[model samples]
Target: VWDRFKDCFRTHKKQEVLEVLYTLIHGTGMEKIHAFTQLKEYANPSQQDRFVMRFDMNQTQVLFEIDGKVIDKCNLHRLLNVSENCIFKVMEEDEEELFLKICIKYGEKISRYPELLEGFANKLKDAVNEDDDVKDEVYKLMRSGEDRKMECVEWNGTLTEEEKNKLRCLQMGSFNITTQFFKIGYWELEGEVLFDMVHPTLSYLLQAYKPSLDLIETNTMLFSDVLNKDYDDYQNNKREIDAILRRIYRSHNNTLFISEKSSCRNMLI
Candidate 1:
């Protein structure tokens, strides 16, 4: 009987919210914001403006304190179970953040294995504002962010517009140089200067140094993934790699070593 009583109370709550949802869906602007402002549990809250939401780890609830204070226990289960529910139609599409919320909310049940959430994403048309290949991309984005948190790199000087262009050209996806650079650099000398920024003529010298940077970055990730590629590929690429190294060595001798200043610089590039 107590179970039945709890069900009835939840049923009435769902009914009250349904009318509110319908009016908001039909209404414009702030109406929609106000609707999900309280119901962020069912959708991604707006990222563009004052409408924001977050899950509370300590309290085990969702907090929405902007004007006065408002809190709601995430009610995805209750919203999902309502018969002929109107809110879920709004809830179901274009919400990668909402998907993330659910993953955290039910983490004990679903976060450990990729397969657990794989099919689940497909059900919601695979998350909002992302590519059709949503599952892998979202995970990739998350992993890259995590990689960044543990990342460190050393470089000298601010990138002038010309140097910035050169960096862009070198990163045109023809090689894994950029990827390898960060992976390798993150674990290298924590406070050492990898290159000198002060020089008489540094432009072309930078071009010479690019390949060496690429090589280190490339090798870092490559070795970790296993050298399963054909040996001849490396053999074929060897001449270019050797050329890059020789150019880099010459560049250092010409410019970097000339500076006697014991100084270090940092970069996120």
Candidate 2:
């Protein structure tokens, strides 16, 4: 049935579609009221009187207005898709404030509906890319988790201060690693692992002593012979010799003192 009417729904002639729907659904009583209330507004020549949404910079307030008149709590229920009774219970304690708060909450889902609908349709048609499902699922999980946390914060009337603090702590701790990198300066390096100053210094020392170390490994006779050369020759190899000495000292300390410490710790038996 949807497949048959899908083309009509996707057509650019919105007025024609609405007119056809209005004609088909037109009836008496509640059906008549529903069609007239919904399609009549769309059938009107001017579109300026429709619902207009506005929010503050901090998003502390969300409002639905029509033709510069703010929709009040009673009529606002008519605009929302939810049942009036459910809306009433949700906003029972603080009608005006909680109504606007609920609007702000669902506004994100409302705004994302078009794109989400398209993606869902594409998936149903089996036209989705391989990674699209993975990406969409990840996005869905993240957004749903965020909405859940926000729900906890929004409906915290029953929660104690300590519980609220714990929620805040959990929210603060749950951050994406990529966002963390951007918050710090590590993102400037383009996903490269950051290293301390000692890393490059050690790499340079290794490079400087590499040739002498190879010579020492292959031919200890020539290595000792070179060690006995004149002062001028020794000066030429000073940097390499110093690097080798540092490496030896580090290895010796690590192998001797570190092992001794491990053995002593194990001696508690």
Candidate that would win on TM-score: 1
- lDDT, model 1: 0.30
Q: Which stretches of candidate 2 lie over 4 Å from their true place?
A: 1-49, 56-58, 73-269
Model 1 TM-score relative to the real fold: 0.22
Q: List TM-score per model, in order.
A: 0.22, 0.18
Summed backbone clashes in each candidate are: 5, 0
**For model 2, how big is the CA root-mean-square deviation?**
30.8
Question: How would you encode candidate 2's per-residue C-alpha lDDT over 1-269 as one tens digit per residue?
Answer: 87778866676554455434445653312123233335435645577446444443323334434445543212322332222332121112222332332233233333334353453433311221223442233223222221211211111023345433322211123322111111110011343222111111111111121112122332323322222232223244445433332332234321111122222210000
What's the distance in Å from true for residue 26, model 2?
Answer: 20
- Predicted candidate 1 versus true structure: per-residue lDDT over 81-200, tens digit per residue: 211221121111223243433333323222233363444433222222222233243333322222322233322343345434333222222222223221111111343223211111
Q: Count clashing pairs, candidate 2.
A: 0
